[PDB]
């Protein structure tokens, strides 16, 4: 029941060794950054 996939799947030799693939439309890498937290005070009465 599948003919063509429109999902941005990865391209590897194990997957492309048994099927034909086309050129990618967007080259993006992997990242490991989650989030950042900035320490600050809202009230700020100095004397800290």
């Amino acid at each position: 029941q599948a003919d063509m996939i429109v999902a941005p799947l990865t391209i590897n030799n194990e997957r492309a060794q048994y099927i034909e693939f086309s050129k990618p439309f967007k080259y993006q890498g992997l990242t490991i950054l989650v989030k950042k937290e900035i320490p600050r005070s809202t009230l700020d009465s100095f004397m800290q």
Binding site: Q28, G29, L30, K36, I38, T42, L43
Partner: protein
């Protein structure tokens, strides 16, 4: 000390002259040191707890208190399978992983997991949509997302030409232009003057406390 005045006289004796000079100098020293500590407090970029770049040293070090979970049963397992360099970490990162994307994205923001290993494709969309995450600059381990068809399908050349012509006219610029919203927060220390009114209000409440204290003082005066 507080630099005020009225205009009615001046100390004639030299003792109060030298004492007033060294006292005014001490006032300049304490106000210049207070301003210097204020600028040193606003210049605190916290240049700490940052990342490395293309490869973090903590990824190769096996730890039990900071598990680097990832999406179970996906393309990251195939990428970790076809490699040979980082093979000693596949056994550690192979266990204790989630097989759902929403569970991982919700877990890394709902205080559950320590970190996640996933491409920036969904990270830039969830970060540019929920306004809760932020992406880095470098993009290590680059990959391409293409479309694969059958070998007996002659339409792959026509669809390929439709993709090429779709990238030559400017339709991809319209899709990426209308599907990538530039929201703010580009760094962890880019706009330090985004509050101010709360920092000034925290002293304003003490000013009001000094006004009530002044009402108590005039209550003592009229007594």
């Amino acid at each position: 000390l507080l630099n005020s005045g009225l205009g009615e006289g001046a100390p004639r004796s030299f003792s109060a002259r030298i004492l007033g000079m060294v006292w005014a100098g001490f006032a300049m020293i304490i106000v210049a040191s207070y301003t210097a500590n204020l600028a040193a407090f606003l210049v605190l970029r916290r240049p700490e707890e940052r990342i490395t770049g293309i490869n973090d040293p903590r990824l190769r070090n096996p730890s039990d208190k900071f598990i680097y979970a990832t999406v179970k049963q996906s393309s990251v397992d195939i990428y970790f399978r076809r490699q040979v360099e980082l093979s000693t970490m596949y056994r550690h990162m192979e266990k204790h992983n989630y097989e759902s994307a929403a569970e991982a994205i919700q877990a890394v923001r709902d205080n559950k997991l320590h970190a996640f290993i996933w491409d920036s494709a969904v990270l830039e969309f969830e970060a540019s949509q929920k306004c809760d995450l932020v992406t880095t600059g470098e993009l290590f381990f680059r990959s391409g997302f293409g479309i694969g068809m059958r070998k007996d399908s002659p339409w792959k050349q026509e669809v390929s030409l439709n993709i090429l012509k779709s990238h030559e006219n400017g339709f991809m610029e319209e899709l990426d232009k209308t599907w990538v919203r530039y929201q703010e927060c580009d760094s962890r220390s880019n706009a330090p003057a985004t509050l101010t009114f709360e920092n000034m209000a925290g002293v304003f409440m003490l000013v009001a406390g000094g006004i009530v204290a002044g009402i108590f003082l005039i209550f003592i005066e009229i007594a």
